[PDB]
Ligand binder design. Structure first.
Ligand SMILES: O=C(O)c1cc(I)cc(I)c1O
Ligand SMILES: O=C(O)c1cc(I)cc(I)c1O
Ligand SMILES: O=C(O)c1cc(I)cc(I)c1O
Ligand SMILES: O=C(O)c1cc(I)cc(I)c1O
Ligand SMILES: O=C(O)c1cc(I)cc(I)c1O
Ligand SMILES: O=C(O)c1cc(I)cc(I)c1O
Length: 583
């Protein structure tokens, strides 16, 4: 829904508080390096102009696009050419391409401090100015995660203030805040990863890909809903996601608020779980609906074969209404199977598609696809088998050893990838074992597939920035729903030529001794990646042996009276024993 004067329309619809937040988020994601108070000045300016348009729409500029108003306001700043050399040229053009320049200049790995929460500090800041405190959270998160879902960011910022309203009056503040903050952080990072993937899917694969994921996903949430209604909500949600992924943040939030009201209006025909969401204020209500659990499979549904294998008009429908037919298949399969990962359901519908494209060209099509459902079942078996093998490994070795196995796997599959990225990604992938291996059957397939999709998407995002591996290129571009199976099926990349051991290639030193154990591990895991890059054909055993000798070497030297001496002296011995082990 567009008005002639969009600034007024969205300020009217959103209220000042949320309008300002979204403006601040917008400024923070387009210009991730600029100071807080710079953006804050621009937000206040925009709010005033918003007000004048609400009072009088005929007044000059009020009919401007929001892109125009936002971008002009960003291009107030005199020199940030120094900060954005590649993007200082953005202010040199206009809509719609000035916006597209901003968009392409978002940094997925900004050079920004992992900020340590400091309780006394943050509590003081809360007291001085809690509005500034809320805004600061928006700016710090939005600048680090420039595709963060803007209306959920407001939700999290209200929750963050909530933690401080509670905790900063307690006798012990650290003990109060900290566990709430680490808990919230994990949810925030999860949200950031989900939205990064939604935007990546829109960007690389078209909104149709997101549309498909959401038909499957919503059919599991709202299985008693009819297909008309699931389609109407997916259309609306897809528009919201596309808005937020394109920086149309005020539209994004206004449209998500309307959808929330639509869903709560129809709660009786969607899910009984919505009762818990539907009396909440707007951001909370949207959050709660977005997080809703899967509903019970409705009773007495027909066999799938009726509409998709028996009916004489199968090939007719595929032909004359392809996307509605395949959407229908996704809804009907999804509503019958909440224990299916959404990615598995999308793979079933892809193979069903391929089966008709093949069969509907035959003299007797039904003879050809009669058994399609019988055949689909391997798409369920394959992941269940992979889950069972990998949780066994996790169970026998724990998270660290599991991350080590994964480092070994991914360095073999993509040895061209930067050592920090192989380590970051491998570590992330290993956490699926803690997250998911102890879940029951109802939930273990969705937990693993969802979580692995998020992490492989991070890899794809990093790989797109500087392409190095032909195989990773393949798995990241071939097909979104086959991404995970693609990465799982990559083998050791023999195209890669190791660069030899020069002698003393990677050297541990005394500064390692004083690091927190997490950091010590990462140093060892980096050592491991580097070993594999020199000896890309090393066996599992040889890698186990060298890693044990690494662990022994650091433990021993960090215990020495003279630590650096130990390193310098015992270094060569380790090099020699290693060389003789890798022969
Ligand atoms: O930081 C402030 O002082 C501030 C003030 C206002 I008024 C609105 C937002 I968002 C802010 O961040
Ligand atoms: O994103 C963070 O790193 C983060 C940092 C702090 I301090 C508090 C919360 I909640 C966070 O999510
Ligand atoms: O992802 C959302 O933001 C979302 C928002 C609403 I409102 C409803 C559903 I289902 C969602 O998935
Ligand atoms: O490594 C995999 O290929 C893998 C795939 C699936 I699906 C589940 C788990 I746990 C895994 O470890
Ligand atoms: O502990 C493991 O399960 C493990 C497995 C492999 I494969 C390689 C290394 I180094 C390991 O530490
Ligand atoms: O929640 C989503 O809408 C979502 C969308 C895609 I595309 C992939 C994953 I994992 C998701 O969780």
């Amino acid at each position: 829904d567009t008005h002639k004067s969009e600034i007024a329309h969205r300020f009217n619809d959103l209220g000042e508080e949320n309008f300002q937040g979204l403006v601040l988020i917008a400024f923070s994601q387009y210009l991730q390096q600029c100071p807080f108070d710079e953006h804050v000045k621009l937000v206040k300016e925009l709010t005033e102009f918003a007000k004048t348009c609400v009072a009088d729409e005929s007044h000059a500029g009020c009919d401007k696009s929001l892109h125009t108003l936002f971008g002009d306001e960003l291009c107030k700043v005199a020199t940030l050419r120094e900060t954005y050399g590649d993007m200082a040229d953005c202010c040199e053009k206009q809509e719609p391409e000035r916006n597209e320049c901003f968009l392409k200049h978002k940094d997925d790995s900004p050079d920004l401090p992992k900020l340590k929460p400091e309780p006394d500090t943050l509590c003081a800041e809360f007291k001085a100015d809690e509005k500034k405190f809320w805004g600061k959270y928006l700016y710090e998160v939005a600048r680090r995660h420039p595709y963060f879902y803007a209306p959920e960011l407001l939700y999290y910022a209200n929750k963050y203030n909530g933690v401080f309203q509670e905790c900063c009056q307690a006798e012990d503040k650290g003990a109060c805040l900290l566990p709430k903050i680490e808990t919230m952080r994990e949810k925030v990072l999860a949200s950031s990863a989900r939205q990064r993937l939604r935007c990546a899917s829109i960007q690389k694969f078209g909104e149709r890909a997101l549309k498909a994921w959401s038909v499957a996903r919503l059919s599991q949430k709202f299985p008693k809903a009819d297909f008309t209604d699931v389609t109407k909500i997916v259309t609306d949600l897809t528009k919201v996601h596309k808005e937020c992924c394109h920086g149309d943040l005020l539209e994004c939030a206004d449209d998500r608020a309307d959808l929330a009201k639509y869903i709560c209006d129809h709660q009786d025909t969607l899910s009984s779980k919505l009762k818990e969401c539907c009396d909440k204020p707007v951001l909370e209500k949207s959050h709660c609906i977005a997080e809703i659990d899967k509903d019970a499979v409705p009773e007495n549904l027909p066999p799938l074969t009726a509409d998709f294998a028996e009916d004489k008009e199968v090939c007719k429908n595929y032909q004359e209404a392809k996307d509605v037919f395949l959407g229908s298949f996704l809804y009907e399969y999804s509503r019958r199977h909440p224990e299916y990962a959404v990615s598995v359901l999308l793979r079933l519908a892809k193979e069903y598609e391929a089966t008709l494209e093949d069969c509907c060209a035959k003299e007797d099509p039904h003879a050809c696809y009669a058994t399609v459902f019988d055949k689909l079942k391997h798409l369920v078996d394959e992941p269940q088998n992979l889950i069972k093998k990998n949780c066994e490994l996790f169970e026998k070795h724990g998270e660290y050893g599991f991350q080590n196995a994964l480092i070994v796997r991914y360095t073999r599959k993509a040895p061209q990838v930067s050592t920090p990225t192989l380590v970051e990604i491998s570590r992330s992938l290993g956490k699926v074992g803690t997250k998911c291996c102890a879940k029951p059957e109802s939930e273990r397939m969705p937990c693993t597939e969802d979580y692995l999709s998020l992490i492989l998407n991070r890899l794809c995002v990093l790989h797109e920035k500087t392409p190095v591996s032909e195989k990773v290129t393949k798995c990241c571009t071939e097909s979104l729903v086959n991404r995970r199976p693609c990465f799982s099926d990559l083998t050791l990349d023999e195209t890669y030529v190791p660069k030899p051991f020069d002698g003393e290639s990677f050297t541990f030193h005394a500064d390692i001794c004083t690091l927190p154990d997490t950091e010590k591990q990462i140093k060892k895991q980096t050592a491991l990646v580097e070993l594999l890059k020199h000896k890309p054909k090393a066996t599992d055993e040889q890698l186990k042996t060298v890693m044990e000798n690494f662990v022994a070497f650091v433990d021993k030297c960090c215990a020495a009276d003279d630590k650096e001496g130990c390193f310098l002296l015992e270094g060569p011995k380790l090099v020699a024993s290693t060389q003789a082990a890798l022969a």
